[PDB]
Amino acid sequence: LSGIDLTDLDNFADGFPHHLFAIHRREAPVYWHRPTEHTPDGEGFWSVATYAETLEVLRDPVTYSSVTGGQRRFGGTVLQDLPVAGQVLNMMDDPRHTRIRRLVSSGLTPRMIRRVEDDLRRRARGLLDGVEPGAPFDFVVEIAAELPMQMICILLGVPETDRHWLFEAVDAGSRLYTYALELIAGKRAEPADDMLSVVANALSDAELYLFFHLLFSAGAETTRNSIAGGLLALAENPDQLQTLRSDFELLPTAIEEIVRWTSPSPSKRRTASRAVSLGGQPIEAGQKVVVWEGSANRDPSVFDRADEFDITRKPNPHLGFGQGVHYCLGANLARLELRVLFEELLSRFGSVRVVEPAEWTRSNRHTGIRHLVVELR
Amino acid sequence: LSGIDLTDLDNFADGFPHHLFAIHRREAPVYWHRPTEHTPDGEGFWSVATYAETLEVLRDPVTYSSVTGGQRRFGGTVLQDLPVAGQVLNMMDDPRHTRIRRLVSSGLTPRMIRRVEDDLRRRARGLLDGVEPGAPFDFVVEIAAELPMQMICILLGVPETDRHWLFEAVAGSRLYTYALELIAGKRAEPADDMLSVVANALSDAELYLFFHLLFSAGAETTRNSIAGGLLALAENPDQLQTLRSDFELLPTAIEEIVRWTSPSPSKRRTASRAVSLGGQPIEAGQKVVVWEGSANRDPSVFDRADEFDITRKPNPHLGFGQGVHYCLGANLARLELRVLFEELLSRFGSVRVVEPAEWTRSNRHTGIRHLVVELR
Ligand code: HEM
Ligand code: HEM
Ligand SMILES: COc1ccc(-c2noc(CN(C(=O)Cc3ccc([N+](=O)[O-])cc3)C(C)C)n2)cc1
Ligand SMILES: COc1ccc(-c2noc(CN(C(=O)Cc3ccc([N+](=O)[O-])cc3)C(C)C)n2)cc1
C-alpha cells in the first residue's frame, strides 16, 4: 500500500482496479492513506476496503457523518470537502435528512412507477428492434444512456421536447442551470404530478437546483453504468448468458449480481464526528473516512467465489445500493431498468460480442463505461 | 419596436446592434417588451435605451433593486431571475452591499496595483516583442485574453503555475473544485491578496461565486475593451496616427474606448415599488432592463455619438456603471488599456484587420471572440 495511490486517477482509467483492492484487503482493511499530489485538499484519509468495516461505517451515521465533524468546516460524501454538504439529501444528517428523504420518497407513487415502466418498455423495444443484427454499434451511446435519461426526465417532469437538448447539457453548466430554474419556477406556478413538483412545492431555491442536478447526473449515470456493465459481464460469461436467456425467472437474482459486480458507485466518504475505533484503528473527530463498496462487494469473507460473476448467486448482500439511512431511493427503479432492458435484449439476442476494448470513465467516484462497441445476433 | 426581439440573440451575433437601439431610442425610450420564445422566464420587462432614464435607474438602488422586489422570489442583475441574488456583491442591496463592497475594495492596495502593473508591463512587452511584423494572428487569443486573465490571477492570488490550466476552465467542476482548495489555502495560510482578504473576513458558497465572478467577468469585460479598442483604432487610422504621436492623449482615448465598446451593455434591476420612469408606470416586482450600450450613443448627451473620437470631452459614459454599484475595477481596466496600447502603439503604426471580427453571441457581453490582425 505504501506505493499505491488511490487518489491517482490513472489507476482507475481502465476500470475499477480490483487488483489494488485485493492488496488493500489483505494488507490493511483499514489504513491511513497519506496525501499525494493527486489527493483533494492535500489531506490524508482513512481508507476502508473490507465488507465488515464498510458496513459498520454505513450503519453508523451519527459517528460517521454525511455532513462534517470535529472542527472541519464542511465535508460531504465525496473525498473532497464540498460546501454543498448539508444542502443536498445525500449530504444531510438527521433531523433534516429524514424530512427531505421522506419528501422525495413521497414522489415515487405507484402511478409514477407505471409511467416510467410503460415508457421504458416502449423505448427498449423500439431501440432493440432498430439494432441491425451482427452490425457493430456503441451500446452506451445508442441504448444504455438513453433509457435512464428518459426515466429521470419522467420522474422530474421534463417535457419530452426538451429531453435530448437537456442531455447535451450533461456553456453546458450554464444551460443546465438556467433551464432547471425555469422548469422549477413552472412547477411552482403550475403544480404537476411529478417528483420535482412535489419537492418544489413542499428546500431553498438553490438547494432545489442541486437536487435536480443530482438525480439527473447521478441517477442517470449510475443506472447507465449498471446496464453497460451488465452487458459486458454477460458477454464475458457466455454460458451464464445462455442460462439466463433460457429462464427469465433467474432475472431477479441476475440483476442483484449485476449490481454487485459492476458497483457503479464504488466509493463513499464520511467524516468522523467523535473518536472511535474501526478495524482496530483509532479515528479522531474530523478525520475523513473513505469506504470502497466496489471492494467490499468482492470481499471473499462474505461472498464465495467473489471474483466470479454468478447470475445464480444467493445470498447476495451487496452494498452496491448502499446500506442504512441513506440507502438508494432509486433501487427499484434501477432494477426495473435492468429487468426490462435485459428481457427485451436477451429475448432477441443470444449472442453478444464486444468488438473493441471497453473505454472506461476515468474516475474513482463512478465505475462507468463511456463506450462499448458490440455486435448482437 | 413591436417587430424587434431584444431577447433573440441572433440580433447580437454580429455585434451590439446599434441600429436597433437607434429605433428603440426614437420610438420608445422606455417600453414594455413582451415575452417571446427567446425571453428568459417567459416574462415581459421594461426596456430602457436612453441615457437619462438609464442613469435614473442606476442612481436609485432602493426603487430599482439589484436583489428583487414585489412578490418575486428572486431577481438579480441579469434578465433571468437567479437565486444567486443576495449572494454576490453586484447582486446585493444595502445594508449588506456596502459592507461587502468595502471589504472587496480594501483588497485593492497600492502594492497590489503595483504588482499588477509590473507584471502587466513585462507581459505586454514580451507579447508585443513576440509578434511577427506583417504576420496575421488572432489578437484576442494571443494577447487581449492573456493580460486581464493574469491581472485577475494576481488580484486573487492564483499561483502562476496554475493560471493557464485555470483559464481552460473558462469543467464547471474543475473551476469549482480548484477554487475551493485555493480559498481553503488562504484561510489556512493568509496571503497578501484580495481573495485572502475576503475569505478571512461571506459564506463558503458565496466565496466561490465571488471568485467565479471576478475571474470570469472582470477578465472578460477587460479583454473585450482591449480587442474592441484595437478594432475601433484600425477603423480610424487617422486617430491611431495622432494617438501614436502623443501618449498624453491616452487617458481621454481610453474613456472613448470604454464608451464605444461598452463591454457590459445591459443591466437588469427589479422595481421595489410603484414608480414612474420616462413617463411610463412601473409596478413593484417588474423587471427593468437598462442598456448602457445604447445609452452611451445617445445623441442628447454625446455629440456625434456614432463616431469614434479619441479627443472626446466631456465623456460621462456609463460603461463602468454609475452610483453605488460603480465598477470597482475601473482603474485596473484603464491601466490594462493604457499599458497595452502604449506598448503596442510604440512598436506599430499600422493595424490591419485581415478577417472580419467574430463576435460573441450575447446581449449580456459585447465581445470579440476572434480578431485576426497584422501589425507593422
Ligand atoms: C444502479 C444504479 C444506482 C446505484 C448503483 C445507486 C447507488 C446509490 C448509493 C450507493 C447510495 C448511497 C449514498 C451514500 O450512502 O452516501 C444512493 C443513494 C441515493 N440514490 Fe441511488 N443509485 C442508483 C440509482 C438511483 C436512481 C435511478 C435514483 C433515482 C431515484 C437514485 C436516487 C438516489 C437518491 C435520492 C439517494 C440519496 C438517498 C439519501 O441520502 O437518503 N439512485 N444510491
Ligand atoms: C472594461 C472592463 C470592465 C467593465 C466594462 C466593467 C463594467 C462594470 C459595470 C457596468 C458594473 C456595474 C454593475 C451593475 O450596475 O450591476 C461593474 C461592476 C463591478 N466591477 Fe467592473 N467592469 C470592468 C472591469 C472590472 C475589473 C477588472 C474588475 C476587477 C476588480 C471589476 C470588478 C467589478 C466589481 C466587483 C463590480 C461590482 C461592484 C458592486 O456591485 O458594488 N470590473 N463593472
Ligand atoms: C457539488 O458537486 C457535487 C459532487 C458530487 C456529488 C455526489 N453526490 O453523490 C456522489 C456519489 N454518488 C453516490 O453517492 C450515489 C448516488 C447518489 C445519489 C443518486 N441520486 O440519483 O440522487 C444516485 C447515486 C454517485 C454520483 C456515484 N457524488 C454531489 C455534488
Ligand atoms: C449564472 O450565474 C451568474 C452570475 C452572475 C452573472 C452576472 N453578473 O454580472 C453580469 C453582467 N456583467 C456585469 O454586470 C458587469 C461586471 C460585474 C462584475 C465584474 N467583476 O469583475 O466582478 C465585472 C463586470 C458582466 C459579466 C458583463 N452577469 C451572470 C450569471
XYZ file of C-alpha atoms in Angstrom, chain B:
376
model
C -40.188 48.067 -31.983
C -43.116 45.569 -31.972
C -41.045 43.766 -34.676
C -37.782 43.716 -32.676
C -36.884 40.974 -30.194
C -34.087 42.104 -27.863
C -34.038 38.582 -26.286
C -33.229 36.973 -29.664
C -29.552 36.610 -29.595
C -29.311 36.360 -33.392
C -29.721 40.141 -33.314
C -26.437 40.315 -31.341
C -24.433 37.811 -33.416
C -22.562 40.474 -35.368
C -22.007 42.936 -32.555
C -24.105 45.225 -30.442
C -26.982 46.114 -32.786
C -26.717 49.915 -32.507
C -29.133 50.465 -35.358
C -31.888 48.570 -33.437
C -31.236 50.711 -30.351
C -31.426 53.866 -32.558
C -35.021 52.734 -33.354
C -35.566 51.994 -29.661
C -34.496 55.467 -28.514
C -36.575 57.196 -31.180
C -39.806 55.189 -30.832
C -39.932 54.497 -27.068
C -37.102 55.386 -24.615
C -38.873 53.225 -22.020
C -41.158 50.456 -23.217
C -42.757 47.162 -22.226
C -41.049 44.427 -24.152
C -43.428 41.447 -24.382
C -42.034 37.950 -23.873
C -41.142 35.834 -26.895
C -39.919 32.215 -27.160
C -36.418 33.663 -26.642
C -37.193 35.501 -23.421
C -35.894 34.046 -20.109
C -38.649 33.173 -17.652
C -41.192 33.873 -20.424
C -41.859 37.198 -18.709
C -42.024 40.696 -20.107
C -39.824 43.536 -18.935
C -39.332 47.296 -19.259
C -36.519 48.089 -21.703
C -34.700 51.397 -21.220
C -32.490 52.689 -24.081
C -31.875 56.432 -23.384
C -29.182 57.918 -21.171
C -31.351 59.968 -18.853
C -33.540 57.111 -17.851
C -30.726 54.584 -17.684
C -28.871 56.924 -15.300
C -32.039 57.472 -13.283
C -32.402 53.656 -12.754
C -28.698 53.227 -11.822
C -28.849 56.097 -9.327
C -31.898 54.852 -7.402
C -30.898 51.486 -5.860
C -33.784 51.429 -3.359
C -36.523 51.732 -6.059
C -34.588 49.712 -8.533
C -33.129 46.819 -6.519
C -30.289 44.525 -7.564
C -31.873 41.688 -5.465
C -35.646 41.571 -6.046
C -38.886 43.314 -5.302
C -42.661 42.980 -5.069
C -43.581 39.325 -4.633
C -40.880 37.976 -6.983
C -38.809 35.350 -5.053
C -35.521 36.367 -6.629
C -34.154 38.608 -9.349
C -30.594 39.825 -9.566
C -28.981 41.923 -12.299
C -29.375 39.820 -15.417
C -32.674 39.333 -17.335
C -33.257 35.873 -15.956
C -34.237 35.572 -12.301
C -31.323 33.816 -10.492
C -31.132 32.536 -6.915
C -27.605 33.998 -6.541
C -29.414 37.288 -5.975
C -28.369 38.452 -2.497
C -25.261 36.228 -2.554
C -22.729 38.033 -4.728
C -21.765 41.726 -4.345
C -23.165 43.049 -7.587
C -26.496 41.439 -6.735
C -26.764 42.755 -3.177
C -28.575 45.813 -1.714
C -27.816 47.813 1.415
C -27.015 47.270 4.191
C -25.021 44.233 3.179
C -23.880 45.577 -0.208
C -21.900 48.407 1.453
C -20.201 46.075 3.890
C -19.031 43.640 1.207
C -18.116 46.409 -1.318
C -15.849 47.953 1.308
C -14.253 44.671 2.176
C -13.586 43.943 -1.506
C -12.154 47.424 -2.069
C -9.821 47.124 0.986
C -8.209 44.365 -1.098
C -7.173 46.885 -3.800
C -3.999 48.219 -2.071
C -1.414 50.476 -3.602
C 1.022 47.467 -3.529
C -1.389 45.157 -5.297
C -1.951 47.766 -8.013
C 1.866 47.970 -8.378
C 2.116 44.132 -8.512
C -0.397 44.132 -11.343
C 1.326 46.956 -13.290
C 4.812 45.427 -13.004
C 3.545 42.145 -14.314
C 1.472 43.865 -16.988
C 4.424 45.883 -18.426
C 6.727 42.818 -18.614
C 4.000 40.683 -20.177
C 2.724 43.225 -22.648
C 6.301 43.925 -23.836
C 7.046 40.195 -24.012
C 3.933 39.540 -26.088
C 4.412 42.528 -28.472
C 8.163 41.708 -28.971
C 6.999 38.206 -29.966
C 4.700 39.371 -32.795
C 5.997 38.614 -36.344
C 5.660 42.008 -38.083
C 3.260 41.583 -41.035
C 2.141 38.097 -39.993
C -1.597 37.577 -39.340
C -2.583 36.329 -35.899
C -5.585 36.224 -33.528
C -5.166 39.294 -31.318
C -7.916 38.050 -28.954
C -6.454 34.614 -28.085
C -2.763 35.627 -28.346
C -2.765 38.974 -26.460
C -6.100 40.528 -25.366
C -7.287 37.468 -23.363
C -3.918 36.844 -21.618
C -3.280 40.182 -19.991
C -6.535 40.577 -17.982
C -6.572 36.872 -17.007
C -3.138 37.422 -15.447
C -4.298 40.603 -13.761
C -7.205 38.851 -12.055
C -4.949 35.852 -11.149
C -2.708 38.316 -9.309
C -5.580 40.021 -7.575
C -6.969 36.671 -6.374
C -3.546 35.063 -5.548
C -3.701 32.218 -8.145
C -0.229 30.628 -8.258
C 1.497 31.263 -11.625
C 1.848 27.534 -12.449
C -1.961 27.106 -12.195
C -3.122 30.010 -14.369
C -3.096 28.595 -17.955
C -4.851 25.431 -16.654
C -7.399 27.528 -14.678
C -8.262 29.637 -17.748
C -9.065 26.495 -19.815
C -11.842 26.137 -17.187
C -13.159 29.442 -18.680
C -15.037 21.827 -16.415
C -17.518 23.878 -14.372
C -16.390 21.056 -11.997
C -12.678 21.834 -12.318
C -13.129 25.570 -11.590
C -15.309 24.814 -8.553
C -13.013 22.220 -7.050
C -9.814 24.238 -7.720
C -11.297 27.437 -6.300
C -12.436 25.633 -3.180
C -8.881 24.460 -2.426
C -7.451 27.915 -3.191
C -9.883 29.551 -0.794
C -9.133 26.929 1.899
C -5.398 27.501 1.500
C -5.776 31.251 2.101
C -7.797 30.568 5.186
C -5.129 28.209 6.446
C -2.271 30.457 5.267
C -3.450 34.125 4.695
C -1.720 35.836 1.846
C -1.463 39.454 0.576
C -4.222 39.270 -1.976
C -7.888 40.095 -2.401
C -9.106 36.520 -2.114
C -7.396 36.169 1.211
C -8.798 39.465 2.452
C -12.337 38.492 1.561
C -12.036 34.854 2.728
C -10.618 35.742 6.150
C -13.221 38.471 6.895
C -19.266 35.741 3.183
C -20.328 32.021 3.305
C -18.191 29.249 1.908
C -20.574 29.031 -1.088
C -20.565 32.846 -1.607
C -16.717 32.851 -1.730
C -16.921 30.567 -4.727
C -19.445 32.827 -6.508
C -17.180 35.823 -5.760
C -14.170 34.030 -7.233
C -16.123 32.899 -10.310
C -17.463 36.454 -10.904
C -14.101 38.304 -10.804
C -12.283 35.612 -12.528
C -14.847 35.376 -15.337
C -16.489 38.846 -15.732
C -13.508 41.053 -14.723
C -11.212 39.253 -17.201
C -13.789 39.042 -19.995
C -15.048 42.690 -19.929
C -11.465 43.947 -19.938
C -10.460 41.578 -22.756
C -13.356 42.836 -24.804
C -12.385 46.501 -24.171
C -8.883 45.730 -25.337
C -9.894 43.901 -28.542
C -12.716 46.353 -29.343
C -10.320 49.252 -28.776
C -7.891 47.813 -31.331
C -10.694 47.381 -33.820
C -12.009 50.936 -33.393
C -8.447 52.329 -33.822
C -7.893 50.186 -37.008
C -11.118 51.553 -38.457
C -9.922 55.100 -37.686
C -6.216 55.018 -38.803
C -6.201 58.819 -38.642
C -6.608 58.858 -34.846
C -4.378 55.858 -34.469
C -1.639 58.013 -36.006
C -2.411 61.028 -33.753
C -2.580 58.808 -30.646
C 0.716 57.112 -31.553
C 2.363 60.526 -31.833
C 1.210 61.749 -28.405
C 0.671 59.316 -25.462
C -0.700 62.135 -23.243
C -3.867 61.644 -25.304
C -4.272 58.102 -23.810
C -6.364 58.879 -20.768
C -9.014 60.635 -22.932
C -8.684 57.956 -25.622
C -9.317 55.170 -23.108
C -12.587 56.721 -21.858
C -13.712 56.857 -25.531
C -12.715 53.182 -25.930
C -14.879 52.211 -22.957
C -17.860 54.350 -24.150
C -17.572 52.905 -27.655
C -17.016 49.234 -26.826
C -19.370 49.173 -23.767
C -18.348 45.576 -22.868
C -21.214 45.309 -20.374
C -24.063 46.760 -22.479
C -27.114 45.798 -20.427
C -28.130 45.683 -16.810
C -31.226 44.381 -15.023
C -32.976 45.575 -11.835
C -36.369 44.907 -10.207
C -38.748 47.581 -9.114
C -39.459 47.580 -5.434
C -42.414 49.952 -5.550
C -44.726 51.749 -7.945
C -42.816 54.408 -9.706
C -42.787 56.290 -12.963
C -39.834 56.056 -15.419
C -39.690 58.033 -18.639
C -43.405 58.794 -18.061
C -44.385 55.067 -18.019
C -45.888 53.419 -14.907
C -43.774 50.575 -13.462
C -45.207 48.318 -10.744
C -43.456 46.633 -7.807
C -41.846 43.346 -8.823
C -41.449 44.162 -12.505
C -38.186 43.732 -14.344
C -36.278 46.801 -15.678
C -33.527 46.285 -18.269
C -31.286 49.302 -18.992
C -28.958 49.332 -21.985
C -25.740 51.225 -21.233
C -24.584 50.241 -24.715
C -27.405 52.334 -26.260
C -27.252 54.998 -23.612
C -23.580 55.529 -24.487
C -24.540 56.628 -28.018
C -27.486 58.735 -27.006
C -27.289 61.903 -29.149
C -28.825 64.070 -26.357
C -25.792 63.556 -24.249
C -22.968 62.827 -26.769
C -22.175 64.972 -29.846
C -21.557 62.892 -32.978
C -22.463 59.885 -30.758
C -21.983 57.376 -33.624
C -18.458 58.485 -34.234
C -15.349 57.190 -32.528
C -13.372 60.209 -31.234
C -10.235 59.811 -29.030
C -10.267 63.531 -28.039
C -13.901 63.297 -26.839
C -14.592 65.641 -23.918
C -16.504 65.709 -21.722
C -17.328 61.891 -21.746
C -19.825 60.969 -18.964
C -20.211 57.403 -20.255
C -21.938 54.639 -18.358
C -19.516 51.892 -19.470
C -18.460 51.285 -15.779
C -21.840 51.766 -14.274
C -22.926 54.633 -12.048
C -23.937 55.046 -8.437
C -23.473 52.617 -5.533
C -22.531 49.596 -7.713
C -19.992 51.515 -9.836
C -17.268 49.292 -11.207
C -14.594 48.548 -8.556
C -12.153 47.662 -11.301
C -12.321 50.807 -13.463
C -8.744 51.928 -12.689
C -7.442 48.404 -13.305
C -9.250 48.181 -16.636
C -7.902 51.630 -17.587
C -4.440 50.506 -16.571
C -4.580 47.429 -18.838
C -5.748 49.520 -21.753
C -3.108 52.208 -21.143
C -0.173 49.800 -20.860
C -1.267 47.621 -23.791
C -1.787 50.473 -26.133
C 1.396 52.253 -25.033
C 3.480 49.180 -25.707
C 1.641 48.236 -28.922
C 1.492 51.717 -30.477
C 5.162 52.211 -29.571
C 6.070 49.336 -31.842
C 3.381 49.630 -34.511
C 1.860 52.378 -36.608
C -0.103 50.038 -38.817
C -3.018 47.802 -37.769
C -4.902 45.828 -40.431
C -7.845 43.580 -39.626
C -7.402 40.804 -42.170
C -10.561 38.675 -41.484
C -13.866 40.166 -40.212
C -14.261 40.158 -36.413
C -16.164 37.229 -34.900
C -18.478 38.490 -32.137
C -19.721 36.676 -29.038
C -23.430 35.859 -29.443
C -24.703 37.608 -26.347
C -26.714 40.602 -25.094
C -25.001 40.487 -21.674
C -21.493 40.946 -23.113
C -20.439 42.843 -26.199
C -17.305 40.950 -27.092
C -14.984 39.817 -29.829
C -14.149 36.087 -29.975
C -11.583 36.378 -32.794
C -9.764 39.316 -34.346
C -7.067 38.361 -36.896
C -4.709 41.289 -37.392
C -1.385 42.323 -38.917
C 0.876 44.781 -37.138
C 3.682 46.690 -38.995
